[PDB]
Design a binder for this molecule. Structure first.
Ligand SMILES: C[C@H]1CCCC(=O)CCC/C=C/c2cc(O)cc(O)c2C(=O)O1
Ligand SMILES: C[C@H]1CCCC(=O)CCC/C=C/c2cc(O)cc(O)c2C(=O)O1
Lengths: 264, 264
């Protein structure tokens, strides 16, 4: 049975969150769009293997929208790592395996380096380390223009799975619709510079499993592959692109379960 | 003024070849389809920076079809390298800069390791090191189905630019049509295990520049990025996919020129 509820943290945030299962903690951190319904299938499938899975909407996004402005403007990996630790504190999760894509990826690595005592192991997928102009320039349009542009980028360019992306349903797309402008304004200018991978030695011998999408163009995350190799970090591929928990839920869960078991 | 001629080597091959310019030798080795017209405008552009540029159809392909069966069956990088060195010998090219994509990449790296006195510097692009079943399963089909399958794969999947591909013209496309069957039977099963890149340390500190197509799916040549990094070899991107010299002649020619000038 899944817990769906909210919990507030001292930093001003009311987090919407979900929990299923018993066992060691696995925490699924959203990409920038902040929407945890994307993990819904996987939450069950990972739990069914003997884990306790927790996920949540990110500050300012979807049902965690009650939050002060600093938590969704000028966002950095260190801010987000701070927020996440706070919700693990409130939920009394002492030790956690963490997964994260994009700004979640930067976040999980930042958790790993910053809170080594809390983080049993981290999976990072497609960590953004470069300023992208076709993303930053979206922030100075109308909100409704940005929602139209980015709903299309997600759907046709980076879903990795158009049908699956669409099958998430109207409620999810209505929430994402409101997140697109918030994301555009708070994330793509400040997340890349914050990437905690500029120090290779801090990376080395850490329980970190990095992945990039099989179908993503080689240029988008080429730098991830070079970085993980220079630091001896395990680096591999998942099917799809930016959202393997959406396009390939079954392979995603198996991957989380199997990487988790390896570090238990 | 391009020389367009034929020269025979004592291993039984009559090569169709092209030469333009005056200056240090730059040799452009085709991909597995073996067709040198794909280089046409880059030949001119590179030579106009002070280089003699030579290129050639590969044995058993296009206008170099007059060759004994061993040169186009069970093909390996060591075999191709040995053929290329035989045509360089015939053209009295003693010290060459070499470009190669795909099996041509395997070949240029095999050239660099095997003939360091002969090779000023080597540029390899998208070097195949993995068995791919869909390529391999085409050998068993009838010539015409192989041509249909592979013509489509090149057009829609890996060209990096379908207009540029189509614009090669009917003559080129009719020589490729004959080459697909020859290529399917001779190359995909035996080229990858011959990849000369399993000895990382022999690549270390060599004059080698490796590239991958910016738009190629990350999975296709992820392994190239790993190997070059482990080995210290310069790795970067060219725009497009498997045929940068068709889809982006200008960036391609400038890249060959710059990289060559680095090694003079
Ligand atoms: C929202 C999602 C949309 C993905 C939209 C997209 O264009 C994929 C390109 C890869 C970059 C994603 C990204 C980059 C950043 O600097 C910060 C981020 O939070 C993201 C990110 O989360 O991407
Ligand atoms: C002909 C060209 C078609 C390119 C067709 C294509 O599917 C691109 C996939 C990358 C592999 C190319 C390749 C693989 C091998 O094992 C041997 C080869 O000679 C090639 C190669 O040359 O690819």
């Amino acid at each position: 049975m899944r817990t769906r509820s909210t919990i507030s943290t001292p930093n001003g945030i009311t987090w919407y969150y979900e929990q299923e299962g018993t066992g060691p903690d696995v925490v699924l951190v959203p990409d920038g769009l902040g929407e945890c319904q994307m993990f819904d299938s996987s939450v069950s499938q990972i739990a069914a293997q003997g884990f306790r899975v927790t996920t949540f909407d990110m500050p300012g996004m979807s049902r965690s929208a009650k939050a002060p402005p600093e938590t969704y403007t000028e966002v950095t990996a260190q801010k987000l790592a701070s927020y996440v630790i706070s919700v693990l504190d409130a939920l009394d999760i002492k030790h956690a395996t963490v997964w994260g894509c994009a700004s979640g990826a930067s976040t999980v690595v930042a958790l790993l380096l910053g809170y080594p005592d809390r983080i049993r192991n981290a999976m990072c997928h497609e960590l953004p380390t470069k300023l992208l102009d076709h993303l930053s320039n979206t922030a100075v349009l109308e909100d409704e223009e940005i929602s139209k542009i980015l709903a299309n980028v997600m759907l046709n360019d980076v879903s990795g799975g158009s049908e699956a992306w669409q099958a998430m349903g109207d409620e999810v797309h209505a929430r994402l619709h409101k997140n697109y402008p918030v994301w555009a304004r708070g994330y793509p200018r400040t997340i890349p510079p914050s990437a905690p991978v500029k120090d290779l030695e801090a990376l080395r011998g850490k329980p970190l499993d990095w992945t990039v999408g099989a179908a993503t163009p080689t240029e988008s995350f080429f730098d991830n592959i070079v970085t993980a190799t220079k630091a001896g970090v395990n680096i591999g591929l998942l099917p799809g692109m930016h959202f393997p928990y959406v396009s390939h839920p079954d392979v995603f869960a198996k991957y989380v379960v199997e990487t988790t078991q390896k570090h238990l």
